[PDB]
Amino acid sequence: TSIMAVTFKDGVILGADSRTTTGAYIANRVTDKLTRVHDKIWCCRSGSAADTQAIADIVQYHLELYTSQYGTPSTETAASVFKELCYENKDNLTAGIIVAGYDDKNKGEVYTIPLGGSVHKLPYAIAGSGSTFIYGYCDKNFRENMSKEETVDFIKHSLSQAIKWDGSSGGVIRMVVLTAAGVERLIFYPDEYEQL
Amino acid sequence: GSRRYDSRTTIFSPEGRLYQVEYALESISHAGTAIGIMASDGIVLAAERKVTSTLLEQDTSTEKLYKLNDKIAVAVAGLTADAEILINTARIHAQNYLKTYNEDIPVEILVRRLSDIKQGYTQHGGLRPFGVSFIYAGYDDRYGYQLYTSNPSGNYTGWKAISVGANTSAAQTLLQMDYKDDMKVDDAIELALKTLSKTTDSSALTYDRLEFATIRKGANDGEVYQKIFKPQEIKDILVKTGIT
Amino acid sequence: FRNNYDGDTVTFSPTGRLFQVEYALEAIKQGSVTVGLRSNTHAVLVALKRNADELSSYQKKIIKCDEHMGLSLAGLAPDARVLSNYLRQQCNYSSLVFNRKLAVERAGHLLCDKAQKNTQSYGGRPYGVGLLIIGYDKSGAHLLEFQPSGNVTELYGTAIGARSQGAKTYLERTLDTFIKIDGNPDELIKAGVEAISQSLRDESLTVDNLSIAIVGKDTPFTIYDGEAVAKYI
Amino acid sequence: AGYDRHITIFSPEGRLYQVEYAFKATNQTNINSLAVRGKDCTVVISQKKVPDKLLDPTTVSYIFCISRTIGMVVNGPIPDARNAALRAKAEAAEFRYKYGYDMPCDVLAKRMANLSQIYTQRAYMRPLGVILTFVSVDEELGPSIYKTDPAGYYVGYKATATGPKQQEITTNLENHFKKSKIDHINEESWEKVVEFAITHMIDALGTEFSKNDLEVGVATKDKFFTLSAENIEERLVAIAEQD
Amino acid sequence: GTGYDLSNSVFSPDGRNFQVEYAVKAVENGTTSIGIKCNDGVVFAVEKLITSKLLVPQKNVKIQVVDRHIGCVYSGLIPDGRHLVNRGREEAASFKKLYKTPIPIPAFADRLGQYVQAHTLYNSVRPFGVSTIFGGVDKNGAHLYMLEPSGSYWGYKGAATGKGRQSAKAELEKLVDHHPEGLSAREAVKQAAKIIYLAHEDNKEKDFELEISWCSLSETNGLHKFVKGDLLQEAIDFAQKEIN
Amino acid sequence: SDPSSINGGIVVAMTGKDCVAIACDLRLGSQSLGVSNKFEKIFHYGHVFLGITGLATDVTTLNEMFRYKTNLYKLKEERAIEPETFTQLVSSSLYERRFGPYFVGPVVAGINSKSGKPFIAGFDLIGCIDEAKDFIVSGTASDQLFGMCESLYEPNLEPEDLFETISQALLNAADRDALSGWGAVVYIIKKDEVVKRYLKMRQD
Amino acid sequence: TTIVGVKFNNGVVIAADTRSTQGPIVADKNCAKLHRISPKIWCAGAGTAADTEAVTQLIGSNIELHSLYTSREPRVVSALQMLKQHLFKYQGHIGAYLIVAGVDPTGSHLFSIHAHGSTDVGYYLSLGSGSLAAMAVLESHWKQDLTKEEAIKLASDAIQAGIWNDLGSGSNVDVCVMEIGKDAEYLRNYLTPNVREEKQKSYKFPRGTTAVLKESIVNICD
Amino acid sequence: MTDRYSFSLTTFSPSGKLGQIDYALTAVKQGVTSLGIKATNGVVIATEKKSSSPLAMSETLSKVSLLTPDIGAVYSGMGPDYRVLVDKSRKVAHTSYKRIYGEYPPTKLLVSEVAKIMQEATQSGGVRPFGVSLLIAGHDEFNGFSLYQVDPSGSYFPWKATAIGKGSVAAKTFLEKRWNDELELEDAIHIALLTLKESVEGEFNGDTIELAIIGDENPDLLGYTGIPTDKGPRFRKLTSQEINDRLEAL
């Protein structure tokens, strides 16, 4: 899996490949690793699917009840629930989750939750098998407050590379833009990102 | 707190009596009469159906005679609902005994278990006793034909002939007046019906107001048999015994 | 009236009173007087031990909870044992876990919350005992008055038990005087014996009748009985 | 014996006084409310009475958002009103989680009604002195109004009213419908349905309203929201330029 | 009949809960305490009666803090007051632990609200003998709240409870009228000291001790703190002056 | 080690023309040691028959259990249980012990008293139901039995023929298995009567 | 086992083989791997036979009760959620791999669940040991917007791939069509391409062939 | 908290009566009438939809309920009590039977099950009996059609026909006169509608009446095809329109 979240001038963008394998077999080539926990708070799932899905499902439910009682939750709070679940059950989970959300006061925010269940807030974060191949690249190309286009390119390139080198990654690249203007789904096909 | 609404169903009266057991019995005194007579070659169970109608589907009905085992059955007097709850646990108990020992539960043993369950609601729990009294009719190879009776108190005893429900006193006198140790099933069958006939709070003793059962050892076999007469079977025996 | 609202602590009277709690408070008044007072260097307890016959012993009124904390009781002995014993655990836990001496002020907050629990739940009963806790901690000497109602209060001095009002007025008067008795335990103690004799009547405090306790700066909470108190009678 | 009036057990008449006394508490607030069904929306009007000048008007309300689609207005004391709200909210979130779709207004009602029924049969649970009106624009049923009471009863309505002058508002509405012949306000926009509701609320109670004497709630396709002093004001001005 | 006031969860025939009502009695009988919501925080003040010169001054503190940004003050049965705050503390802690963000005043309010209302549901518990004024600053401003034994609570601009509750409510209302644009944290501390001094007339028998605490975005960085030393005396003076 | 291979034994059911048959061996041994030549693995409750192969203790237990269940069933339902229903009972009974099953392989055979139709069914140790219209095999020599049946068997055999067929399958399969044999019994079930025969076979 | 799912313009179809096995031996030459969760929600399952059955019925039983309680049609996402949370609760210990489909008030749906509890969504899916043979066929002939017939062929062709090319699969082809407007049509043995050829000889034994030791009649009547 | 009501709330009085059960039955008496009639090829149950406000929509509430696809129930007494009793009866059918035998329970037993539930609310700690009486009608392969009545006491009995609630005495008398062991289902339906009219004050039509039957298998109501042995539910609630049609032949 190859997933990343990048914060920019107008908010934040989440990206991912669509490949989920069981060994060398691609069980699903059109997977949607971009999951919605709240209106403008989404996450990137890597690690066990049965685990990230179960965790996500439970989080969405917690944020729903939270809203019912105290209004919209912060992107931070969302990271907090994910973390609580991952840390408290670290012994039976294999989930690496990136939490990204658009806020009006905070704009864009990204929290990465690695295997130990720790939480890290950063300008952008990469994760999944393919992530290792693009550390140098992403470190050398990321910039803060990029425009929507620059950021869609940054993600498009980074992941096309990770998909290139990592066999556990592939299919199409999916993105989700989160800004004051709402939520936008973006999809890029092999033929487009391969020759980049 | 809650103590304010607690009836304390399990306490003694200044006279050393158990209120609820007493009252429960009071309730049973108004239930259809059930009679059990034990003859040398079999046992008889006869009971009076309380409240009936033209519309009451009698073929599909059972409110007094219940089969517990293959060699044991009971006649009820009191809250049917309550009776069932106990009857089901009785049916289970029989099976467990069989499953553990690979032998059919001895009549008295089943009766003691049931009585113990009642006795309990009498000493602890804060719940009401079961408004039921049983006439157990059964047969085992240790005591042959046996007849027992148990009530809300939790006590049980054996009988040659006995009755429960309404007008027991009347019936007991009549039974005590015509019972003989060397009776035969048929004889008992008659004596049973005759007694009900004389105690019935109703006009006439018709089949549609009865439930009958016999535990006999059909000679042409050697095994004991439980027969819970069907509407027509009662209607017949009723004409035969001279009550048409 | 009152008869319909005092069958348990989970019932309020039409006036907002909790009788069962008040009846408990009564057990205290029926109890032998005991006095507490403190300066800035020490805190002291003086209590009148009551005996059954003249063939019986006099029952202990003072209990030690730690090297820096202790108290005197008036009312149901058993309940004092329960409460003091619980206050010992708390001091203990404060050490074992934080290597910290349980501040008197906190010990009080703890007692209050413990008591309160027996006045809002069915089946429970209030504690029929009053307590006077003294102690020396990081903020100095302290005196606390514990009431079964849960009300714990910090004072310079006070008394509880039958005729307690006598001593209390006496202290309320002597205030500016004993509060300055620093660097001298014996003086603070004598002022304590005086306050208590102010609630005498029946007899006069004797050696196997008087009970004194003291805690302070370099003084670990220590109880004095018999011959030990002789020098104060 | 005479305690058959302190706990929820039968009286010889076969009645449950505690349940009846519960109902009695529902009017304790002296607020009336009504709900009507638009062509494709549902509106609930409720009176708002903030007498104290020290109170922050904005924090006072008997209208609740149980979920994105379900709204609930309560007639009864507020502490029981909130206990009920919270439970419904939880019941709503759990339903979604377990079944994978938003709990339907009517189901939520049935669940709360069954919950009430229990306090009716179990001795240690007192009923809640509140009547709950649930509204939404069900994805399967269309605009919906379901109301539950301390007896553990509930049903769906074409429209409904609750509170002290319930009967005046009811019969008013009954008449409007006997006239229109349809079971709903034939209006496309909810603003007009809101105006309709407010109007008849006035006709039936014979009273004039100011932006702060009301509380409005609207339920549209995929969203239930409450109006603001201004949203209402603009709505009040509307009915005014028709009278 | 009657007796509808001996158990806590019972509805009188007119739909009331006398036990709760009797609780309110215990409250009104208590000391007076107020809350003033300034334009960027909230100020809390309370009446501390000096039962005797024996009470160590400044020692028996009443106002309590929950977490680091919420303040609580209550009139009535103090022990019940603390009990409630303990629950609030656990309640706030549970919240922060899962959502990270320190509990929002409103959410906290309903947290205490549901708990209190919970004690009007069973006859096995007694309602709270306290009314509580609490509040603080959060993500969107300041909030003042008052909670009644019934579990009821609303947001206030000013709030008072206890013996001198009326004098106060009287004064608080005056403020609200003569300050449509808002009161400053600094000013609310003064005004509070005055309002406490006035409300002390319905108890002018025993001498008292003032205790103020505030939570201001600009004055205490959104953290709840006790007003001490100079600023305190300054207010005691501003009050002592206007009481003559 | 393998529970289902400690005691040995085999069972096989077969359908015919308005009749069903079920047969088993009589061996009960511990590993190589032969212990009892009288351990029947077929039981019946009313007109429904059940053969159980596997760990003898569980075989015994499962029978005692089904008796108990079928008895109560008759008291409450007021009729004897049918094969189809029993099969369901047996299945759920086993799956109830999903993560600690009885080491058995149950075979059900009977004729539906109301439909007259013949019925047979097999189960894996956790209830998986196999409802065959021809034959069901179970035991340490199940492979041999499959080979025997798959060939020997043919539809609508008369009772007298089905007997020869089921016997030869059981008999020959058993002889190729060290843990089966030592005697055998075959049941021929019809709507009215049920005949039980004991076969003569090798004793090694 | 070969099971597949394929959505078409107005519904969804699912198919499967009919071979059951324990090791290299065929236990059931014709079992049904298509389970009904509700009248219009059917599930095709691979893995531990008993498990696919039990889990299928359990969620079915609950879907039924829920339907009655809510007075609404069962929704596929409800069975999907119920199943998955169940399977997940059981740490994959319940060897069930299912392809669930059907039509409800919200439209037509196609999902797949894995014993550990994760779920996927698509227009065509396959599971089981024939998964790959089938998927090859699907990856080769699926196109967006298939007619009910096209879909049934495609599905059935995929199952064949498995029967023929996978040793764990065989026998017949069971199909179930769930079209948005109508009743679900379950076609048991929609294809039976493996009928055994007539045996070379009849092995009917001459009566008396078997040697009998003893004989008796059995008592069934109580 | 904690239900400290661990003692029975229904006890024996010196007269031997069980107060609450008696009072519960009184509650049943007060409830709207409902009846049941068993024909040689079906059963019918019906009651009146006593709309408690012209604004309320009586459809959004069923007094007649499906327990299994071959068993229906109807009551008289406290609506809410019936409601939860139905859910319980639907579940118990699965938990204690369909999940064990893979087939729906036969009428007598499911009834037996519901009875037990009520029986318990008559003896368990801290509860009151159910204020309803039920009329359950169904069919099973080995018992044919049947009609049962379940009381708050926990007692139940089979009926050829009967009624409960308000004008039960009246209706019961009217049924004894019109019932015979040769009625076809349509006959009972007719008799049902007649027997009902008597207890009806105002409007009497398909919108005020609620009636269902337990007759032949409705494969058209199955939802799917392809399985020979699954023929459809025998239970079917009549539509408003279906009711009015019959009312004209009244």
Ligand SMILES: */C1=C\C(=O)NCCCC[C@H](NC(=O)[C@@H](NC(=O)N[C@H](C(=O)O)C(C)C)C(C)C)C(=O)N[C@H]1C(C)C
């Ligand atoms: C689909 C094929 C597949 O998914 N896997 C092939 C392996 C066998 C799975 C399944 N067979 C069975 O369930 C057996 N029984 C057992 O496997 N019992 C297990 C055992 O004894 O080890 C226990 C631990 C459950 C048959 C006899 C029921 C199978 O055939 N799967 C097919 C499809 C689902 C019918």
